[PDB]
Design a protein around this ligand. Sequence first.
Ligand SMILES: [Mg+2]
Ligand SMILES: [Mg+2]
Ligand SMILES: [Mg+2]
Ligand SMILES: [Mg+2]
Ligand SMILES: [Mg+2]
Ligand SMILES: [Mg+2]
Ligand SMILES: [Mg+2]
Ligand SMILES: [Mg+2]
Length: 334
Amino acid sequence: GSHMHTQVGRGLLGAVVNPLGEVTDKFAVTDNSEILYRPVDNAPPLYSERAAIEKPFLTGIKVIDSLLTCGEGQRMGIFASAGCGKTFLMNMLIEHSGADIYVIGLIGERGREVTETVDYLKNSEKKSRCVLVYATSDYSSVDRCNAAYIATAIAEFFRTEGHKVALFIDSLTRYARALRDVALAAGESPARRGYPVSVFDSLPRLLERPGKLKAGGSITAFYTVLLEDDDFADPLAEEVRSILDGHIYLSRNLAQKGQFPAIDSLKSISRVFTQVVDEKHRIMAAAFRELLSEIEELRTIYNKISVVESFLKQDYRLGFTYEQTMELIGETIR
Ligand SMILES: [Mg+2]
Ligand SMILES: [Mg+2]
Ligand SMILES: [Mg+2]
Ligand SMILES: [Mg+2]
Ligand SMILES: [Mg+2]
Ligand SMILES: [Mg+2]
Ligand SMILES: [Mg+2]
Ligand SMILES: [Mg+2]
């Protein structure tokens, strides 16, 4: 029973907040200083309170805005091994999208990693729209957990205000590991992979707090899962794969090969694709995948590779409008 409240409001915009609710850096100063307190534990919305996911959440990233289109209110998994560009991708998603407010939660990262992110925010137009909650690796399992809840809570308040909120949580694997430790310390039995069954049981309550509301406002959430290399095939990834509305997988093959972002579209899916894009889009996109699968058949030892790879590849500094992306799609299937 967390009776613990935390600060929420426009006064946090620009702020870097720690697991104890105090501000330790800024990447922007905000003209408003609204601060209220709100509970860090909160039930997800009632089913009757949710709106259908129908309007797309545009990312300004060609390959996902076209083949893996996201909806406002959705929850999307990001599954990456190390050094495959995951943090560049998170930063792309923040930069080239159109949310009113971005809440980021970094869980158990090294202080260098939290600084990468803060550095990014300090040089970005979104600086006045973001809040960063972190728990560096010198913090306790409890503090790491509360970092995730504080992040969600702040998002929740901005959603109740009406805003289109984007929530990023990096990582769920360190959140789960911290939750595990808390559970072992309370004396419960380890199920498969040393995790007490309660860590996986609690996930839905955390991961279903996002969504779009009838009353106005939405949280669209991106959750990171750090993969090992073919190690145990990964219980947590599977759980997340099943709880969420789709998953983007970052490929090693594509990462070493220079193909950034290293998004493998074969291993990826938005489970709300059908219902956030045109009939026209579906067909153009379906045609692009056909073009892909066939280009993959040549990769077993024609000229439309350069043009396609040029479509996929995208420097983290560039954002493409939906029209631009679809414009580009049209020329590769014509
Ligand atoms: Mg786009
Ligand atoms: Mg990151
Ligand atoms: Mg400490
Ligand atoms: Mg709350
Ligand atoms: Mg994991
Ligand atoms: Mg583990
Ligand atoms: Mg499945
Ligand atoms: Mg239609």
